[PDB]
Amino acid sequence: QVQLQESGGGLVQPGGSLRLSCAASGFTFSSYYMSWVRQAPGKGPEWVSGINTGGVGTRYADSVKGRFTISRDNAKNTLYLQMNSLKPEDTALYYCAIGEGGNRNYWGQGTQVTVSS
Amino acid sequence: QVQLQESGGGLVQPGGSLRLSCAASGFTFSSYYMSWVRQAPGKGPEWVSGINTGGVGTRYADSVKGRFTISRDNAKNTLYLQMNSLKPEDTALYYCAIGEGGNRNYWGQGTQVTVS
Amino acid sequence: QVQLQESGGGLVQPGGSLRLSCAASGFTFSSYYMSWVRQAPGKGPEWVSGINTGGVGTRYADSVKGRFTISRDNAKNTLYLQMNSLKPEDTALYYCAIGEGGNRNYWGQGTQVTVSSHH
Amino acid sequence: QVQLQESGGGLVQPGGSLRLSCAASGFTFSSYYMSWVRQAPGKGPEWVSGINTGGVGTRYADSVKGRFTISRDNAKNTLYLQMNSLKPEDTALYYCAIGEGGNRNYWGQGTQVTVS
Amino acid sequence: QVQLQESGGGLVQPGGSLRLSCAASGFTFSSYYMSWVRQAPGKGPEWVSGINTGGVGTRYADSVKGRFTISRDNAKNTLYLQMNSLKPEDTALYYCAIGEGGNRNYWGQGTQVTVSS
Amino acid sequence: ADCAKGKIEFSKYNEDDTFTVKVDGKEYWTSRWNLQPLLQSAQLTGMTVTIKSSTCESGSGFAEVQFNNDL
Amino acid sequence: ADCAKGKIEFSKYNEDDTFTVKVDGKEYWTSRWNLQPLLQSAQLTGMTVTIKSSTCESGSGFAEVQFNNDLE
Amino acid sequence: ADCAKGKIEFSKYNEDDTFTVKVDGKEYWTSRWNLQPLLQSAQLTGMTVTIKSSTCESGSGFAEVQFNND
Amino acid sequence: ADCAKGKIEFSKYNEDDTFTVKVDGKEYWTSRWNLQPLLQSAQLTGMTVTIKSSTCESGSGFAEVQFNNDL
Amino acid sequence: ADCAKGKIEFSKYNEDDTFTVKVDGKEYWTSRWNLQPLLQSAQLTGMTVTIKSSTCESGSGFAEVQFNNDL
């Protein structure tokens, strides 16, 4: 069964850092573009970052460019997101998504991130 | 050498459920698109469901979309079909097929599903 | 080097059966379409059967369809031809070839098949 | 988690030699074209050399042709640059880059080479 | 780094045979088409034989077709040339080349093959 | 069995990397990657494609297709 | 869920081996390789492309497109 | 041996991922994936293809071909 | 940074399996295999290509380009 | 060294998966797979190809080639 297991979330103070991890199983991970999408409360879903099969070719949304860095470990079937210098505008539920993140059926149950004082 | 062995059929009551399993051998299963096709008595063959090599992409016929769900265990070289809320129309011999199921050369000796 | 070693031929009576096997070496067998070609003395070469890498997609000549079965064992680097219900017309020298036959450079040193009776 | 670690730089007298080494990790190195780019202070970036996967096919900028030689050990997942007969015009920061080196995101934290 | 080491040459009488060997290193040998080129004295370079990766697809120059046989051992990173029934017109320096032999930088230092009485 | 014979109405690349074509008002899809450029070039050039499949209802999977030029 | 329907204004091959297309003033990108030759063909021939996605306003890329030829 | 010389009548993608072409009333198939786009372009453009094979009977497989424009 | 904007004057397949294109009198090469047919078709159709690279001198490597049809 | 400059007379896919082209009455072959679609397009469109090789005799192998449109 295809499964995506996000972890690494929680409560961080503004300016702080967090490292999200998503452990993929039940499909050949190396065959898929992987991305991270966040869903802020009250707002719609926001695509945040993407990475090609290969882990060399990354994409970032303008809102996180420079603060976030996506990586993949095809040997360990895991996807990561390094979130540095966190603004409150990033308090959202972060989903690890198979593909470009255009389909919510291919997301895992998100990891909660809350940047507050 | 290639072999497909369907199982999990039987007589179910309408609204009931069944889980068909097809055990593949004689070819590297993980490398092929797999699909399920049904052949109702008197009617022609009907494609039912399909799944990609990657293991994430699924396709379903309009007639069964929402009630059926295809899956694969590349570790166990098995293809499955979860048939929930069964209608009498679904009464047929189910074939497990290599590819899109467009040529009978690539189907197993199907399992019988009877809904009444 | 590349080597194809056909075996399994012989003298068979009409209606009889034979299993040709060709043992490939010197190349990664699993990466090539394989086929069987026969050539009867007096006639030109006749393509008989073909198999894609993987062993799911098989092709047969009209004259052999139904009686012959091509298979491959990529684990054992062997190609097989199950010849059932043979006719005297099936008499020839059977070559195992890399690809779709076509280029004699890609055939092996064949295996003789001889379908005959007391007539 | 992609990492390129350049080393082998330093202070060399004109006519001297240096061997830069870039140690790649976090991606299958053997699958990528690799190149070296230099950034002279005040000037823009200059592509210097390139090498295909497989390691036979090299490219050099006209300014460095004959003096520099790119190589790769797909076994030690390292990229090298043999800089012989160094001119003051080569005083830059040498970045090791994945691909053709046309995008700064695909470079490591460069090693310093000073020829005076 | 890239190295090609030809061997197996020498003095042969007409009609005789020789087996040239070229030992490749410093590049993934298995990923390249390999060929043999000869350079006769006074004449230009002559392509002789070629083999695709994998060692199934061989090509021969019309001048050697039927007498010469190219092979490769990707496990031993070696390329071979079986020269049978040698004519004096085979007297040349035999280079082992990466590719189709259209780049002199990717040839070895040659092996001498002299056929005379 | 010949399911549909006609000019390609439209083609569609699917989320599961399959490829659909509507020929003679019936849609058929294929998992074959090699067919993708062949079918697009057919649709563009105005070829008469013949979809052959054991399953002929619209939405069925197919693999065997014959291409004939316009006339 | 039709994202954009129209002729391809321009296409762009990206450094990350993705492919962007501007259809109906909006840019869309895809990680699919097979789509690259299909999209420029469509661009060159003047085809009617329909970009489909469930999450059409996230900045997420598409992978589903319908191609129709132009009429005169 | 030149089996057939002519314009491609029709092409067909097969269930076994091979590709058939009928040239000069005789059908020939190929397992080569590289040939699929080359043969389609030859069919579309109206090129005169020369099928070369040791087995020249219709239904025989081939691999070597020559393409010439009109 | 946009290095060159213009029609492809010529293309060249290199011995190292790279591909050069001279656009606006400046030559640029790419290691990307997928770009080879795309640049081939852009050259043939007379498309105005925009080569984007951090290294803009002629002979530099590139991997990002934009294709627009002619007027 | 420029071996041949001209329009492709004919192309040929070989049994060893190589590809021959006769340009300016001289035949040259290549083991490069990416060149196969590039060459026939060039043949079809009527492009003037420039074959560059160290071995220039007819039947030699080659890899580098430049494509220019007809005009």
Author numbering:
A (entry chain F), E (entry chain H): 1 to 117
B (entry chain J), D (entry chain G): 1 to 116
C (entry chain I): 1 to 119
F (entry chain E), I (entry chain B), J (entry chain C): 20 to 90
G (entry chain A): 20 to 91
H (entry chain D): 20 to 89
From the paper:
The Stx B subunit comprises five identical copies of the B domain (~7.7 kDa per domain) arranged in a ring-shaped pentamer with a central pore in which the C-terminus of the monomeric A subunit is anchored. Through its B5 domain, the Stx holotoxin binds to the globotriaosylceramide (Gb3) receptor present on the surface of target cells, leading to subsequent internalization of the toxin.
Furthermore, the Nb113 molecules and the Stx2a A subunit are located on the opposite sides of the Stx2 B5 domain. The association of Nb113 to rStx2aB is mediated by Nb113 residues from both, the complementarity determining and framework regions (CDR and FR). More precisely, the Nb113 paratope consists of amino acids from CDR1, FR2, CDR2, FR3, and CDR3. Noteworthy “interaction hot spots” are rStx2aB Trp48 and Nb113 Arg59. Especially Val56 seems to be the “interaction hot spot” here, as it is the center of a hydrophobic network complemented by Val2, Phe27, Tyr32, Ile98, and Tyr106.
